[PDB]
């Protein structure tokens, strides 16, 4: 058993490779050149993933939810993660139950961010996702709470990707999975499940 987290550009996107794709999020307006993805693969299958888009290219903050956050100043340089995906049922079956695939992808996100020159990451999450990010210990920053609907609250967040954040999620995954300490410091990531 082994867990691989690494990134691929849209530009890069045999049997197992289509199994992965057959398990991926069906595209949208923001899936094109420039867009990168982090894929979590265990025994030839997609267990989790997340998408990264440049802040200056069209994205969910600048377009989809324009009316919601047009009052927030956005840096010229940056990345927005989205389509945070985790298949809990498949992770359990491959990485055993109680495995923190969620905390791992967060770690993969910080590590990928450092490897690509991003101090932090901008994202739009749902109330629930916010609850999880909060519980993860990751020192996220709500830039603005907005109302999608009458009761639907969504948030614009900055996810810290400094060394402290990396070590913090790393140490978390360690004492949690008991995996080798150096295994959470690299990019790409590779975890013994």
Beta bridge partners of 42: 3, 45
Experimental method: X-ray
Task: Please say whether the beta carbons of 120 and 164 come within 8 A.
Answer: no
CA 173/CA 94 separation, integer angstroms: 17
Tokens 């990707």 map to which residue? Answer: 161
The beta strands (E) that lie in 55-152 are given as 79-86, 120-126, 141-147
The CATH number of the domain covering residues in 1-193:
3.40.630.30
* Listed resolution, Å: 2.5
To 10 degrees, the CA torsion angle through 129, 62, 82, 161? -80
Q: State how far the alpha carbon of 95 is from the alpha carbons of 3, 124, 142, 190, in Å.
A: 8, 28, 31, 13
CB atoms within 10 A of CB 184: 24
């Amino acid at each position: 058993h082994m867990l691989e987290l690494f990134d691929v550009s849209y530009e890069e996107l045999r049997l197992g490779w289509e199994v992965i794709c057959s398990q991926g999020m069906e595209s949208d307006e923001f899936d094109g050149p420039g867009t990168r993805y982090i894929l979590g693969i265990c025994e030839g299958q997609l267990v989790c993933s997340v998408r990264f888009t440049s802040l200056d290219r069209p994205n969910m903050i600048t377009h989809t939810f324009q009316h919601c956050f047009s009052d927030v100043t956005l840096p010229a340089y940056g990345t927005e993660s989205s389509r945070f995906f985790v298949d809990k049922a498949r992770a359990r079956a491959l990485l055993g139950e109680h495995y923190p695939i969620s905390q791992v992808l967060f770690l993969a996100m910080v590590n990928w961010a450092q490897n690509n020159a991003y101090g932090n990451i901008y994202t739009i999450v749902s109330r629930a996702m916010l609850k999880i990010l909060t519980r993860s210990g990751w020192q996220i920053k709500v830039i603005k709470e907005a109302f999608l609907t009458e009761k639907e609250r969504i948030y614009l967040l900055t996810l810290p990707a400094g060394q402290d954040d990396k070590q913090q999620l790393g140490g978390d995954v360690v004492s949690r999975t008991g995996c080798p300490p150096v295994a959470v410091t690299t990019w790409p990531l590779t975890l013994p499940v």
